[PDB]
Design a protein. Structure first.
Lengths: 50, 149, 167, 167
């Protein structure tokens, strides 16, 4: 058996329990990573800085 | 030129899907907020509030002692528009039935912060008596019409 | 931090400043709906927390934090119907048409109920004023918040002309 | 050092601010039960310390040390019984059902005892109010604390209906 997902869920739950002002910036990073991983490709062209 | 570049960034389908993603996440967040913290419209009682239970406790003053009694309800199934209350078979008298009078209706309306309609008066006065076959008959007038038991 | 049961505040009626208390829970719960320490804030019984709109902003200005009000100070009646010795008062509530019933015995003498009486207390939840006189309406509006804070539940305003002909 | 016999404090009743004193001993004892310089705080004799719940929180803010209250401001009666010219008043006390007795001679006239009388003083430990009006109950609740400090021992609240009926 495997239970990595349950461990990650528990970590996120404990993080939500210990709420601070800086949880929102971490949530923003996570959602941005998910969004970029999901579609990508479409709006990336030129602009090596981007 | 900046506007022209922005509008021609992606095809329409990708824009629709990206809008759908954000809209779904926003609605999920709003639902999560609505679950925990409670809604503004507490009058409808939604589902996060009680007072949907079968029994309701009230008190009344008699002679020199304060007494308590229960008031029954349907538990959530159905609603009566005429009485504005969760009444069960209020047109018949039996064990477990509901009966609301003006002496308790006002207190219940104050407790629930909404109006309710009482169903019948508390008492009536007998005017004549007839005895037949070892039984006694009582007569009284209700709403201008003759009634007997 | 604070275990206080009552909170003081002031209001102006008839050109003078009166005072009244606002009850609080005293240390249990938080009531995130309106972020105030309330005791059973769903019943109009005596001793329950009642934050009116007119004083909600003053309280949220004395205490430097936002505070959400619970009920409006007063509402205006629109129609009245008598039935078997009872009187129904109809008024709007957040866009829904509702009503309220009371005994007819309280309406025998309007003078002890109208505006700022000599006794300083109201026997019932309704008030009567003349609709033509601007000053009477203004005084009733001013006293509505004070009389809705002295005792719980909002105050219903009745026009004298409307109820004059039913009696 | 500071053997201050009396401490000033204020309360709100009928829209005006009255004043009353709280007694203290001074340099004898500490009464660690409620950390105050009390004088025989276990007896209801005149001049004894009677720090009440409604004033404990207020006094804890003029000073900057915690203060423990001694007795609640008032209680609500439940039932009464007359016998041999005496009347017994039953009320709850911290979960225990107790009773208190008084003479029936004081109940001959209620108008000189109810709420804020013209004299401004109460002849007996009980108060009578009309329970059908929220304003009367609120006024009685607000004014109970001031008389609970003018004279020691808690104040008992009586509903008009029961005593009037048994009268």
């Amino acid at each position: 058996w495997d239970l990595t997902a349950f461990g990650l869920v528990a970590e996120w739950f404990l993080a939500y329990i210990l709420f601070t002002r800086f949880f929102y910036v971490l949530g923003l990073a996570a959602i941005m990573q998910l969004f970029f991983s999901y579609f990508a490709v479409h709006f990336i062209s030129n602009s090596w800085l981007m | 030129w900046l506007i022209i570049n922005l509008v021609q960034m992606a095809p329409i389908s990708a824009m629709v899907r990206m809008y759908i993603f954000f809209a779904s996440f926003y609605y999920v967040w709003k639902s999560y907020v609505h679950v925990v913290d409670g809604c503004n419209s507490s009058t409808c009682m939604m589902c996060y509030k009680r007072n949907r239970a079968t029994r309701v406790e009230c008190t009344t003053i008699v002679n020199g002692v304060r007494r308590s009694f229960y008031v029954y309800a349907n538990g959530g199934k159905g609603f009566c528009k005429l009485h504005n209350w969760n009444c069960v078979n209020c047109d018949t008298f039996c064990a477990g039935s509901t009966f609301i009078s003006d002496e308790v209706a006002r207190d219940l309306s104050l407790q629930f912060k909404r109006p309710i309609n009482p169903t019948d008066q508390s008492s009536y006065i007998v005017d004549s008596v007839t005895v037949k076959n070892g039984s006694i008959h009582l007569y009284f007038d209700k709403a201008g019409q003759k009634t007997y038991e | 931090r604070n275990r206080a049961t009552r909170v003081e505040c002031t209001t102006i009626v008839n050109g003078v400043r009166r005072s009244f208390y606002v009850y609080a829970n005293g240390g249990k719960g938080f009531c995130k709906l309106h972020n105030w320490n309330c005791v059973n804030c769903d019943t109009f019984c005596a001793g329950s927390t009642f934050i009116s709109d007119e004083v909600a902003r003053d309280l949220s200005l004395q205490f430097k934090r936002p505070i959400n009000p619970t009920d409006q100070s007063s509402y205006i009646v629109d129609s009245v119907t008598v039935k078997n010795g009872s009187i129904h008062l109809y008024f709007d509530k957040a866009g829904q048409k509702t009503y309220e019933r009371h005994s007819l015995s309280h309406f025998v003498n309007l003078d002890n109920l109208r505006a700022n009486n000599t006794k300083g207390s109201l026997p019932i939840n309704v008030i009567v004023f003349d609709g033509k006189s601007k000053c009477e309406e203004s005084s009733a509006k001013s006293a509505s918040v004070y009389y809705s804070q002295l005792m719980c539940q909002p105050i219903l305003l009745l026009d004298q002309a409307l109820v004059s002909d039913v009696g």
